[PDB]
Scaffold this motif. Structure first.
Motif, short mmCIF file in Angstrom:
data_model
loop_
_atom_site.label_atom_id
_atom_site.label_comp_id
_atom_site.label_asym_id
_atom_site.label_seq_id
_atom_site.Cartn_x
_atom_site.Cartn_y
_atom_site.Cartn_z
N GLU A 71 0.81 -1.21 0.00
CA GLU A 71 0.00 0.00 0.00
C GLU A 71 0.84 1.27 0.00
O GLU A 71 0.32 2.36 -0.23
CB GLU A 71 -0.94 0.01 1.20
CG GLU A 71 -1.84 -1.21 1.26
CD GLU A 71 -2.70 -1.24 2.50
OE1 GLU A 71 -2.39 -0.52 3.48
OE2 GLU A 71 -3.70 -1.99 2.51
N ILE A 72 2.15 1.14 0.25
CA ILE A 72 3.05 2.29 0.26
C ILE A 72 2.98 3.03 -1.08
O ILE A 72 3.20 4.23 -1.14
CB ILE A 72 4.51 1.86 0.53
CG1 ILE A 72 5.40 3.10 0.66
CG2 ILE A 72 5.02 0.94 -0.59
CD1 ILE A 72 6.81 2.78 1.11
N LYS A 73 2.64 2.30 -2.14
CA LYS A 73 2.54 2.89 -3.48
C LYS A 73 1.54 4.04 -3.53
O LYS A 73 1.70 4.98 -4.31
CB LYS A 73 2.14 1.82 -4.50
CG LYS A 73 2.10 2.30 -5.94
CD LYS A 73 1.79 1.17 -6.90
CE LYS A 73 1.79 1.66 -8.34
NZ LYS A 73 0.73 2.67 -8.58
N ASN A 74 0.53 3.98 -2.67
CA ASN A 74 -0.51 5.00 -2.63
C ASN A 74 -0.40 5.97 -1.46
O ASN A 74 -1.33 6.74 -1.20
CB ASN A 74 -1.88 4.34 -2.66
CG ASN A 74 -2.13 3.59 -3.97
OD1 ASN A 74 -2.39 2.38 -3.97
ND2 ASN A 74 -2.00 4.30 -5.08
N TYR A 75 0.72 5.94 -0.75
CA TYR A 75 0.93 6.85 0.36
C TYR A 75 1.78 8.02 -0.11
O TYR A 75 2.88 7.84 -0.63
CB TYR A 75 1.62 6.16 1.54
CG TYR A 75 1.69 7.05 2.76
CD1 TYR A 75 0.60 7.15 3.63
CD2 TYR A 75 2.82 7.82 3.03
CE1 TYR A 75 0.64 7.99 4.74
CE2 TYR A 75 2.87 8.66 4.13
CZ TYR A 75 1.77 8.74 4.98
OH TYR A 75 1.82 9.58 6.07
N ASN A 76 1.26 9.23 0.07
CA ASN A 76 1.96 10.43 -0.34
C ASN A 76 2.73 11.03 0.84
O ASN A 76 2.14 11.63 1.74
CB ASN A 76 0.97 11.45 -0.91
CG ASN A 76 1.65 12.62 -1.59
OD1 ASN A 76 2.83 12.89 -1.36
ND2 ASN A 76 0.91 13.33 -2.43
N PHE A 77 4.05 10.85 0.83
CA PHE A 77 4.88 11.37 1.91
C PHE A 77 4.94 12.90 1.94
O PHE A 77 5.36 13.48 2.94
CB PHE A 77 6.29 10.77 1.84
CG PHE A 77 6.32 9.29 2.13
CD1 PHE A 77 6.43 8.82 3.44
CD2 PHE A 77 6.23 8.36 1.10
CE1 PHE A 77 6.44 7.46 3.71
CE2 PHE A 77 6.24 7.00 1.36
CZ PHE A 77 6.35 6.54 2.67
N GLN A 78 4.49 13.54 0.86
CA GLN A 78 4.48 15.00 0.78
C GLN A 78 3.27 15.56 1.52
O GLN A 78 3.26 16.72 1.94
CB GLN A 78 4.47 15.47 -0.68
CG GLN A 78 5.68 15.02 -1.48
CD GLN A 78 6.99 15.36 -0.80
OE1 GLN A 78 7.70 14.47 -0.32
NE2 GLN A 78 7.32 16.64 -0.75
N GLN A 79 2.24 14.73 1.68
CA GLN A 79 1.02 15.10 2.39
C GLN A 79 0.69 13.97 3.37
O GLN A 79 -0.26 13.21 3.17
CB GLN A 79 -0.13 15.37 1.42
CG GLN A 79 -0.45 14.24 0.46
CD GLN A 79 -1.45 14.63 -0.62
OE1 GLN A 79 -1.81 15.79 -0.77
NE2 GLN A 79 -1.90 13.64 -1.39
N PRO A 80 1.48 13.86 4.45
CA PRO A 80 1.31 12.83 5.48
C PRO A 80 -0.06 12.84 6.14
O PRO A 80 -0.66 13.90 6.36
CB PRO A 80 2.42 13.17 6.48
CG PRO A 80 2.59 14.65 6.32
CD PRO A 80 2.55 14.80 4.83
#
Length: 149
Positions: A83-92
């Motif tokens: 699911e990390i593929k869909n996690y945006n680290f720029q908008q936690p």
């Protein structure tokens, strides 16, 4: 045994992924294993997936995994992590679609319990319990606990 091997494989995979994020490894806890195992057996008996009372009450974090066959520890961890593929680290922040991944790598989570049970039709139900519970939604929590790879 089969149970010990499964536990060890789930732990190994979780810790390899946590190392990719620079957060401390988790430790298995026997009591948590027993609770997760008990719940997996409950799920296998009804064959209906749903979160436990402990999970619903925020006492423990919880990840669930179902398959028509007997699941290996590595495949379960890999599926949750993907699911990390869909996690945006720029908008936690929290999102249901990335909840399994964020619980796995939650920095502040220290211990885990793992359980697996098969239903009458051979399908398997896997339950992972996490303590302390992750996926804390308040501002700043995700930025501090879900680190980029």
């Amino acid at each position: 045994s089969a149970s010990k091997q499964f536990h060890n494989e789930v732990l190994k995979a979780h810790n390899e992924y946590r190392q990719k994020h620079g957060v401390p490894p988790l430790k298995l806890c026997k009591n948590l294993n027993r609770e997760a195992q008990q719940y997996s057996e409950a799920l296998a008996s009804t064959r209906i997936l749903k979160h436990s009372p402990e999970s619903s009450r925020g006492q423990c974090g919880e990840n669930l995994a179902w398959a028509s066959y007997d699941q290996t520890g590595k495949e379960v961890a890999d599926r949750w992590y993907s699911e990390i593929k869909n996690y945006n680290f720029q908008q936690p922040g929290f999102t249901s679609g990335t909840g399994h991944f964020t619980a796995m790598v939650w920095k502040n989570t220290k211990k885990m319990g793992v359980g697996k049970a098969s239903a009458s039709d051979g399908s398997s139900f896997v339950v992972a319990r996490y303590f302390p519970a992750g996926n804390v939604v308040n501002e700043g929590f995700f930025e501090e606990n879900v680190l980029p790879p």
